[PDB]
Design an enzyme around this catalytic site. Structure first.
Site, short mmCIF file in Angstrom:
data_model
loop_
_atom_site.label_atom_id
_atom_site.label_comp_id
_atom_site.label_asym_id
_atom_site.label_seq_id
_atom_site.Cartn_x
_atom_site.Cartn_y
_atom_site.Cartn_z
N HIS A 1 41.47 40.73 40.47
CA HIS A 1 40.26 41.88 40.77
C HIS A 1 39.64 42.81 40.67
CE1 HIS A 1 40.83 38.46 44.59
NE2 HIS A 1 39.79 38.33 43.70
N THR A 2 39.38 43.07 39.10
CA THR A 2 39.39 44.28 37.82
C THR A 2 38.92 45.32 38.77
OG1 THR A 2 37.35 43.58 36.66
CG2 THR A 2 40.13 42.83 35.68
N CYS A 3 37.83 44.91 39.70
CA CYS A 3 36.20 45.49 40.27
C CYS A 3 37.12 47.24 40.99
CB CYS A 3 35.12 45.25 41.68
SG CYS A 3 34.47 46.33 41.55
N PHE A 4 38.74 46.32 41.72
CA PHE A 4 39.60 47.71 42.29
C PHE A 4 41.11 47.53 41.89
CE2 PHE A 4 36.31 46.39 45.47
CZ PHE A 4 36.18 45.44 45.29
#
Length: 382
Positions: A355-358
């Protein structure tokens, strides 16, 4: 059909080998071309506009000349490294808001997209510059979104690519696709005029072409059209101009050998990744620092080669850009967000996920080092 580079697409051929082939094919295509040096005169404080004036009218053939940069009025300065300097400047200028050509993607301040808001000529010139950099084997410090790289590669953009453009919007599409619309308590519409979703008014429930009622049967098609508009339709003329400029120098069939991840490494370079720095700045959830899968994870990453280390960074953070201040300064949406690994309690049959957003890696509790390494390589190289 005019080439067979497409047969080497995919992961069978390591990036380094693809890169070497790519360079060799450019050289084959330039056999007998009699190149020369071509002066580019620019004011240091107007590199982007002066370069445009100096080059935008050149033929593709002339753009294969070695560029000789001359900074207006600067005499008796050393002459080494001026082309490199010029590429660095124009890379920054090629992202300056005042030209209104590119803007950051929602969420990710690293990656840029075409500004949906003269201009077509400049987009073509930017496409030319990006291809010229690649042709010259020089780097641009410019990162784009996943769907933008796919466009260059000639690949179909999918609704899943929206996870790179705009994570929060993607979450909304995911909710829509996974849940029955008939249990919402209201109805969704798709606007044929702007290609976005809305909420039905009573008049939309009656026959009309303005707002189409969304149903279980048609929601996948409208999710598709909404994503196509955001990633392609809204910027259609600009994209076409950019692509026309790029392909004049690097043929589509040639660049198509790379994946989306590898095109980024080709344009902006293969970073060096300080694993000790990353490891000193990693957080763990439902694993501890000494959990066995964590020891295996560090051993596997260290066992990867330069390209695979970089693709790992891309996999978990969304880009291959290392932060200026090191991994202590990796950011999420609203500030610092260190690389973090979570134990994934679902089947050990799954690949790790991200989950690249995090900056988050979900890592199943694999049963052996060799399996972990194998699974992680698959996850990354995809």
């Amino acid at each position: 059909s005019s080439g067979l580079e497409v047969l080497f697409q995919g992961p069978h051929m390591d990036f380094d080998v693809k890169r070497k082939y790519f360079r060799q094919e450019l050289e084959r295509l330039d056999e007998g071309l009699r190149k020369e040096d071509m002066a580019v005169h620019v004011r240091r404080d107007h590199v982007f506009e002066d370069s445009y004036r100096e080059l935008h009218r050149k033929s593709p053939e002339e753009m294969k000349n070695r560029l000789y940069i001359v900074f207006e009025g600067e005499e008796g300065q050393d002459a080494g490294g001026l082309l490199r300097e010029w590429y660095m400047i124009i890379s920054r200028e090629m992202f300056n808001p005042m030209y209104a050509l590119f803007r950051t993607s929602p969420g990710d301040r690293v990656t840029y997209t075409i500004n949906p808001s003269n201009h077509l000529s400049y987009f073509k010139f930017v496409g030319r510059i990006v291809a010229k950099a690649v042709y010259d084997n020089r780097l641009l410090e410019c990162y784009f979104t996943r769907s933008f790289y796919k466009h260059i590669l000639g690949k179909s953009v999918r609704y899943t690519d929206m996870e790179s453009e705009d994570y929060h919007f993607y979450q909304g599409l995911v909710y829509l696709l996974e849940n029955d619309v008939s249990t919402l308590g209201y109805d969704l519409t798709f606007s044929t005029e702007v290609q976005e979703f809305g909420v039905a008014e009573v008049r939309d429930l009656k026959p009309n072409g303005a707002n189409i009622l969304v149903t279980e049967e048609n929601k996948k098609e409208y999710v598709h059209l909404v994503c196509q508009m955001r990633m392609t339709g809204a910027i259609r003329k600009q994209l076409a101009a950019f692509l026309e400029g790029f392909y004049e120098i690097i043929p589509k069939r040639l660049i198509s050998i790379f994946t989306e991840q590898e095109l980024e490494l080709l344009i902006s370079g293969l970073p060096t990744i300080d694993i000790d720095d990353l490891k000193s700045n990693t957080e763990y959830h439902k694993y501890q620092s000494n959990s066995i899968q964590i020891q295996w994870f560090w051993r596997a990453l260290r066992s990867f080669d330069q390209a695979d280390r970089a693709k790992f960074l891309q996999f978990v953070t969304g880009t291959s850009k290392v932060p200026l201040q090191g991994f202590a300064a990796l950011e999420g949406m609203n500030g610092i967000q260190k690389f973090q690994i979570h134990r994934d309690d679902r089947s050990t049959d799954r690949l790790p996920s991200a989950h690249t957003c995090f900056n988050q890696l979900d890592l199943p509790a694999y049963e052996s080092f060799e399996k972990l390494r194998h699974m992680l390589l698959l996850a990354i190289q995809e």
